[PDB]
Design an enzyme around this catalytic site. Structure first.
Site, PDB file in Angstrom:
ATOM      1  CD  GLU A   1      -3.207  -0.642   0.142  1.00 32.95           C
ATOM      2  OE1 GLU A   1      -3.306   0.800  -0.269  1.00 32.95           O
ATOM      3  OE2 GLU A   1      -4.175  -1.177   0.364  1.00 32.95           O
TER       4      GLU A   1
ATOM      5  CG  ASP B   1      -9.007   4.212  -3.950  1.00 33.14           C
ATOM      6  OD1 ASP B   1      -9.959   4.933  -4.918  1.00 33.14           O
ATOM      7  OD2 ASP B   1      -9.805   4.205  -2.562  1.00 33.14           O
TER       8      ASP B   1
ATOM      9  CB  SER C   1      -9.239 -18.967  -6.025  1.00 27.67           C
ATOM     10  OG  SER C   1      -8.565 -18.767  -7.757  1.00 27.67           O
TER      11      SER C   1
HETATM   12 CL   LIG Z   1     -12.206 -18.293  -8.097  1.00 24.88          CL
END
Ligand SMILES: [Cl-]
Ligand SMILES: [Cl-]
Ligand SMILES: [Cu+2]
Ligand SMILES: [Cu+2]
Lengths: 164, 164
Positions: B13, B22, B119
């Site tokens: 960051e 941002d 994931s």
């Molecule tokens: Cl995924």
């Protein structure tokens, strides 16, 4: 784990997850977080609900008490730096001696510790033995002797031997 | 061991003491602290004054920035623990990899990270290379490639090699 101000006050204050009256009779919670000086338990419940951000019913978690503790230690440090009498005394003191001062400001508050005057002048003038003897005669030592004895050792020796 | 989640996010960051926009375009400050979704600088300054407790005038100190950072990191950990899809993945991961999940939540929020169904399942089943290949196929990787690469490398290897 090593030695620091957070671990110092943890041995002194201890952890309590429910609203309790302190040494002075005021409603407190967590690691010595003063809620109110008001005699009402209801007045303390409102202050607790405000600090946590939910309906606590006078009960908090260890993590919730940790947040207040970290906030109170930080508030004590900024309080010393913003006080005209406390700040010159603080800056002169070493790392371990600064912790002993925070402990007092955590326990009594900004205005309470700033009222010592003579004891604060003695620590700024590096007179460790003279300040240690003078602190025992104070009202703070008579009320909480077990607590003060460890803090006095820290201010006189400049070491954290009272907790080892 | 100087490497952890706080240091990981300090690299990713960075620190900024003036109100900036941002990658998405929203007003931010400190170490990636989102202030408002409003396109007004006057509104953001008000949200910064309410967060700090003074007339900041768009500028904060490193200490004030560290306070907001500690709040956001803590909020990211609670976001994982309160989420039913995030918590089992978190509990199954080693320290180095837990930090990479907190990193994603700090950046995107609990809801957005929970959207990585496959994931997350691959991370829970310890399928590191498979999770790495699938995470790179996301919009997260396209919008911010360099930060995603580092987080992916952390999940793939289980080391701090992507940072140091
Ligand atoms: Cl995924
Ligand atoms: Cl307090
Ligand atoms: Cu502070
Ligand atoms: Cu928390």
């Amino acid at each position: 784990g090593p030695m620091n101000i957070f671990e110092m006050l943890r041995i002194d204050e201890g952890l309590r997850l429910k609203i309790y009256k302190d040494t002075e009779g005021y409603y407190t919670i967590g690691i010595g977080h003063l809620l109110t000086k008001s005699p009402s338990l209801n007045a303390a419940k409102s202050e607790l609900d405000k600090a946590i951000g939910r309906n606590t019913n006078g009960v908090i978690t260890k993590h919730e008490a940790e947040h207040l503790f970290n906030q109170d230690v930080d508030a004590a440090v900024h309080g010393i730096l913003h006080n005209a009498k406390l700040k010159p005394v603080y800056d002169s003191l070493d790392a371990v001696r600064r912790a002993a001062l925070i402990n007092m400001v955590f326990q009594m508050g900004e205005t309470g510790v700033a009222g010592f005057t003579n004891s604060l002048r003695m620590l700024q003038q590096k007179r460790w033995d003279e300040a240690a003897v003078n602190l025992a005669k104070s009202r703070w030592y008579n009320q909480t002797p077990n607590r003060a004895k460890r803090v006095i050792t820290t201010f006189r020796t400049g070491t954290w031997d009272a907790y080892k």
